[PDB]
User: Which sequence fits this backbone?
C-alpha cells in the first residue's frame, strides 16, 4: 500500500494477484502489451516481465501521477488517446518490433465497444484479457466469432482500495459475404421488440425462415443460428 495522497477510479492493492493476471497473459520478455486504463499498478509488475508496454489513458489527471509512478521502468510509454478513437494499428507499427496481448481495465458502458474495435480491424494480437465485474463474466460472450473465452481466475473486493461491494473477475480471449456484422447490428436495434421490427430498421423485403420463429427476439438466437440468416442475400 504505497498508494499515497493528490486526492482520495478505484484501484487494486496487492501484487499477489497481478502476476496471476500476468500469468494468464501469455506474457514474456518476447511479447509486448497494450495496457488500457492504467491508474496507478498493473502496468508496473507488467513492465517487470514484458518486452514493452503501451498504456492507453483518456484521463489527463493520471499523467503527472504516471510521470513519477512507473517512471523508473524504462520499457513503458503512456500514449494519451481515446482508445475507442485511437490509432492502435498505427501504434503497433510505431512501438513493437513480438506477440502482443492487450490487458484492459474498462467500465461496462464502453468496455464492450472497445473490445470490438480492437478485434474488428483484424489486428494481429495473441489475445484480449479484460477485468470486469463478477456478475458480467459469469453471464456466459457477445461475439464468440472472433474469439472463444475462458473466465479464468476470480478477483475479490478484498484486494481493492475503495473496496467496491461486488467482487470482480478476469476473462482472457485468445483469438483464432460478412454483412453478417451489419446483420447483428440491425437485429438488436429495438432490443425488446419482435424480429419484424428490428429488420425494419435495416437497409431495404421477402424472407422465408430457415427453421426459425418470426416473432422470436434478438438475444435468443444461437451464434451458429445467426450465421444461417445472414446467408439470405449477402
Assistant:
Amino acid at each position: 500500500i504505497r498508494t499515497k495522497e493528490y486526492g482520495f477510479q478505484n484501484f487494486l492493492i496487492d501484487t499477489n494477484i497481478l502476476n496471476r493476471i500476468v500469468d494468464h497473459a501469455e506474457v514474456t520478455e518476447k511479447t509486448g502489451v497494450i495496457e488500457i486504463g492504467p491508474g496507478i499498478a498493473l502496468t508496473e509488475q507488467l513492465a517487470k516481465r514484458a518486452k514493452k508496454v503501451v498504456a492507453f489513458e483518456i484521463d489527463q489527471r493520471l499523467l503527472p501521477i504516471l510521470k513519477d509512478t512507473l517512471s523508473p521502468y524504462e520499457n513503458v510509454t503512456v500514449i494519451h488517446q481515446d482508445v475507442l478513437k485511437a490509432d492502435v494499428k498505427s501504434v503497433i507499427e510505431e512501438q513493437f518490433q513480438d506477440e502482443i496481448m492487450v490487458v484492459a481495465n474498462l467500465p461496462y458502458y464502453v468496455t464492450t465497444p472497445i473490445i470490438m474495435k480492437l478485434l474488428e480491424e483484424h489486428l494481429p494480437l495473441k489475445g484480449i484479457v479484460v477485468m470486469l465485474q463478477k456478475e458480467v463474466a459469469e453471464r456466459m460472450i457477445a461475439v464468440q466469432f472472433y474469439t472463444e473465452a475462458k473466465t479464468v481466475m476470480i478477483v475479490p473486493k478484498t484486494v481493492f482500495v475503495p473496496q467496491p461491494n461486488v467482487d470482480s473477475a478476469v476473462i482472457r480471449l485468445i483469438l483464432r459475404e460478412s454483412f453478417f456484422f451489419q446483420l447483428i447490428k440491425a437485429s438488436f436495434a429495438q432490443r425488446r421488440k419482435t424480429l419484424l421490427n428490428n429488420l425494419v430498421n435495416n437497409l431495404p423485403q421477402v424472407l422465408e425462415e430457415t427453421n426459425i420463429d418470426g416473432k422470436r427476439r434478438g438475444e435468443s438466437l444461437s451464434i451458429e443460428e445467426f450465421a444461417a440468416l445472414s446467408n439470405g442475400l449477402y
